[PDB]
Design a binder for this molecule. Structure first.
Ligand SMILES: O=C(O)C[C@H](NC(=O)c1ccc(NC(=O)NC2CC2)cc1)c1cccc(C(F)F)c1
Length: 166
């Protein structure tokens, strides 16, 4: 049992809250936190930059060792690394970046990675700096993920739009 509080129930297994995922991870210390990664695990900005800064750059040092050994991930793929001070594990998931011309169909493959874990704290994949429509990202999440997902949405106006239009 992870100590999530204040989430709104959208479906049987999807919950949502207006919160920064970094602050939710620091407080809850969940079994799994999802990072919105790129294929190189270069955590510069957005959710990845913010989670990495909260680990004092330990997530980036571990990630560079992983890439030196294994090479890059695929768009739609994932890897499990340490959660450091934020969680037991971090599931690094690569959603398509539409600003780079990546195929939005890969968003469903990205969310399929969540089904390997019973419960996760996660952001909306491919939203924010990745350029995709967040309303579409929540619909793909609800229609793909079967395990328990707790979505932390940073922007209040987007949170209100997501709930109202669901
Ligand atoms: O969560 C959402 O609302 C979707 C998306 N989120 C991010 O891009 C996102 C980026 C960073 C962080 N966390 C921090 O930066 N933490 C601070 C302490 C360093 C969290 C989430 C977003 C946010 C703002 C505006 C828009 C708009 F384009 F629609 C989308």
């Amino acid at each position: 049992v992870n100590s999530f509080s204040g989430y709104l129930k959208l479906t049987d297994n999807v919950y949502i809250k207006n919160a920064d995922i970094v602050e939710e991870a620091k407080k809850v210390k969940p079994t799994v936190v999802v990072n919105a990664a790129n294929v190189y695990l270069k955590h510069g900005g957005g959710v990845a930059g913010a989670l990495n800064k909260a680990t004092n750059n330990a997530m980036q040092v571990e990630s560079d060792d992983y890439i030196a050994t294994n090479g890059p991930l695929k768009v739609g793929g994932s890897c499990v690394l340490s959660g450091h001070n934020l969680a037991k594990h971090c599931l690094h998931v690569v959603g398509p970046n539409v600003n780079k011309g990546e195929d939005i169909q890969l968003l469903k493959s990205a969310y399929e990675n969540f089904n390997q874990h019973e419960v996760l704290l996660a952001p909306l994949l491919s939203a924010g700096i990745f350029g995709a429509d967040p309303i579409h990202s929540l619909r793909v999440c609800v229609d793909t993920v079967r395990t328990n997902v707790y979505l932390a949405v940073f922007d209040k106006n987007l949170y209100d739009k997501l709930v109202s239009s669901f």
